[PDB]
Structure 1
Amino acid sequence: MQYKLILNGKTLKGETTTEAVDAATAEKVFKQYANDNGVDGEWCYDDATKTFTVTE
């Protein structure tokens, strides 16, 4: 299933999508993505929209 991540960073802005088994797995992918790009923010998840949001 497709989950979306919306990065509202101080330097990196945008959105992306990946296909994972569940929301628990999509997070780790999105958490790894953010770390590799030097993102430290506050995370939120909406299961009705399948959207992870990270804001610095």
Structure 2
Amino acid sequence: DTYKLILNGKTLKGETTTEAVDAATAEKVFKXYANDNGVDGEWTYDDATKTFTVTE
């Protein structure tokens, strides 16, 4: 399935999707997009849209 990440940095904002078998593969692609943009923060998940958000 298509999983999405919304990257909500303080100033650096972005979005990305990855095709993955499970959510917690997608989350661990997304944490390493997030951290390697140099952006960390609180993490949420929306099951209905398969979308993570990291908010700095």
- TM-score for both structures, normalised by structure 2: 0.88
Runs in 1 of length 4+ with deviation above 2 angstroms? none
Deviations 1:9-45 (A, max 9, x none): 0131021111011101100110001111111111000
**Aligned pairs, number:** 54
- Which runs of no fewer than 5 residues in structure 1 stay unpaired? none
- TM-score for both structures, normalised by structure 1: 0.88
- Which runs of no fewer than 5 residues in structure 2 stay unpaired? none
1:52 is paired with a residue of what secondary structure? strand
Q: Please give the alpha-carbon distance, in whole angstroms, between the structure 2 residues aligned to 1:15 and 1:38.
A: 14
- What is the aligned-residue RMSD (CA, Å)? 0.8
Q: Please give the alpha-carbon distance, in whole angstroms, between the structure 2 residues aligned to 1:15 and 1:29.
A: 13
